[PDB]
């Protein structure tokens with residue numbers, strides 16, 4: 001009974017992918033990638049995780065099932081990462097972490113637990129946000145409304161429009177925040193704006209849900225967590241879905257976590273058991289290899305030092321490319337003020353190009369970008385920067 | 397808003413697990429395990445998969461995302477395994493395989509695709525069946541009804557009761573079949589009964605869904621697939637959810653597949669895209685490591701030969717333990733006819749013990765079994781067999 005099944009829509013970036021690797025003209029640059037690439041245009045496996053994998057290969061004696069919530073060093077290590085090494089949330093044990101199939105997995109499992117065990121009906125997502133947000137919440141039956149965020153004109157956070165649309169949210173609604181490196185704009189709240197949002201969130205009764213996929217990409221591990229940390233000193237309950245796909249280069253091993261924080265130990269345990277019921281009814285218990293690698297890097301001082309250096313080198317490469325982009329455009333010369341690029345954090349930002357301009361970029365030059373003008377800065381190299389900027393100057 | 401959350405029910409086997417590893421009296425035998433154990437009571441990682449993992453460690457250059465459906469050798473290898481190396485289904489390409497987070501993952505993703513894209517409302521599951529079946533289908537909004545299967549008295553397949561309850565199923569209902577080694581009874585249809593079921597299934601318009609977790613444990617790889625194969629020569633459409641957790645000893649790496657078969661190439665592609673939409677909204681794209689290991693063993697003749705020997709040794713160990721169990725009980729002596737144990741396939745079977753007897757087994761002897769009298773034959777060793785049988789004889 002499958003003949004009247006309508007084909008699923010062409011996926012936003014995976015379409016571009018197929019179109020690109022069909023254009024036989026190799027001056028082509030794909031900036032619509034979604035993954036990190038180094039100066040060589042390669043997405044390598046990190047040295048710390050290969051050292052990790054050799055260790056595991058030498059020491060694993062069984063592939064027997066992990067518990068519903070995954071390996072128990074993993075969840076003490078990401079909540080130390082998230083909340084700080086001596087957080088009251090950890091000492092009073094009101095946080096529980098379930099290891100999930102990446103950050104998307106963490107969001108579907110939070111959405112199913114919420115849909116089955118609480119009275120939430122709406123989730124507020126930023127306009128724009130990472131596109132797969134709507135699908136995950138909708139599939140668990142939650143409805144997505146969106147709140148204002150990006151100011152197209154100044155290319156900044158329209159904070160007043162943000163605070164103003166978020167008042168049609170009632171008490172008991174969930175509001176999704178990107179912890180650092182907002183996808184897709186790269187504009188983040190400043191710590192002071194985070195603190196007002198945290199204060200407004202208690203007054204209004206929002207359930208905060210942090211999507212935290214880029215820890216370490218804006219400024220550093222601790223610094224990037226201070227927004228979330230302003231929101232867990234103020235609130236009895238919150239959920240954070242984190243990913244290790246990007247900061248560990250472990251994309252395909254699916255490594256993420258769903259952390260539940262509640263008022264005290266008794267209620268977080270009673271709620272976490274229902275979150276465990278949600279995992280049993282989906283994939284039963286999580287993938288060992290990627291989370292195992294993360295646990296031994298983060299618990300070993302020597303391996304952790306290496307990973308931290310490797311993550312800082314990624315972060316700096318992105319910051320150098322954003323810088324090189326802005327002034328190589330100023331050398332190729334056009335009426336521009338692309339300096340907002342320097343102000344945004346992470347791999348993505350809107351270039352400000354129109355869809356007709358990204359179309360003739362693709363068609364006439366072989367530069368591939370997402371139709372919204374979204375560009376991934378990690379697809380730029382010292383070598384492809386000059387043809388890239390010539391192409392952009394020529395279409396402006 | 398978590399304080400009135402009711403704790404999730406005590407999990408059927410994981411409870412026994414905690415109770416067992418709290419009984420400080422080491423003549424204790426846990427037969428309620430659910431996993432394979434060798435003669436040493438260990439669940440080892442196979443030699444073929446460690447050889448596999450060394451190869452992958454030496455040759456992987458990226459952990460970049462797999463496509464929604466996973467690695468493309470994996471899905472040609474399990475549908476060759478499932479349908480036979482030159483099946484018409486494969487040559488006419490009407491089957492598509494998505495690599496999923498184990499066999500449970502394959503069932504949730506089949507359930508979500510069905511619930512969102514077709515008009516199914518009921519799934520028929522055997523009484524008894526693997527317990528997590530109800531939860532997976534219920535969470536996607538499908539309702540579970542059950543069909544008769546096990547005859548408690550003769551300890552056999554009550555085939556007529558089976559065919560008779562399955563007539564309240566209407567056209568468009570899904571009926572779940574265990575491909576071989578029925579969990580939890582170990583009684584399988586004979587090929588002739590499979591063929592009548594296949595013929596009755598077309599006449600009535602059932603969507604067959606095969607749960608195939610034990611390939612290679614009843615008789616051998618090809619032999620164990622002939623039931624499913626009687627049901628894919630007769631039917632335009634079916635879904636099979638397979639697992640690699642047990643036959644590859646890869647439990648915690650989550651390795652499974654959801655294969656969709658439709659009337660022809662065009663419709664299976666159009667349906668498969670919606671199945672891909674279901675993955676995007678859940679965990680996005682699957683775990684590479686376990687499926688990667690399975691792909692290189694199954695594609696390498698030398699590694700595949702080793703795995704096949706290793707799987708036959710598991711199968712034979714279980715068959716020898718079922719045999720040793722029945723006659724060591726006949727040596728310890730009681731009014732019994734435990735010979736039905738020899739007739740059942742796989743790791744599980746109902747011992748026929750009452751819940752009061754399994755209770756005094758636990759309490760007075762330290763032998764742990766599931767309250768229904770369910771016993772896992774792979775928890776028996778040549779060494780623990782004699783105290784085990786004494787304990788059972790003493791409670792009969």
Ligand SMILES: *Cc1c(COP(=O)(O)O)cnc(C)c1O
Nearest residue numbers: 102103104130183211213243245
């Ligand atoms: C990458 C990302 C995720 C999910 O990552 P996984 O690959 O599923 O671990 C979630 N939210 C945002 C904003 C992301 O960028």
Ligand SMILES: *Cc1c(COP(=O)(O)O)cnc(C)c1O
Nearest residue numbers: 498499500526579607609639641
């Ligand atoms: C083991 C099993 C599954 C699922 O196995 P995974 O560990 O999730 O791969 C599904 N059905 C039956 C009958 C099983 O025994």
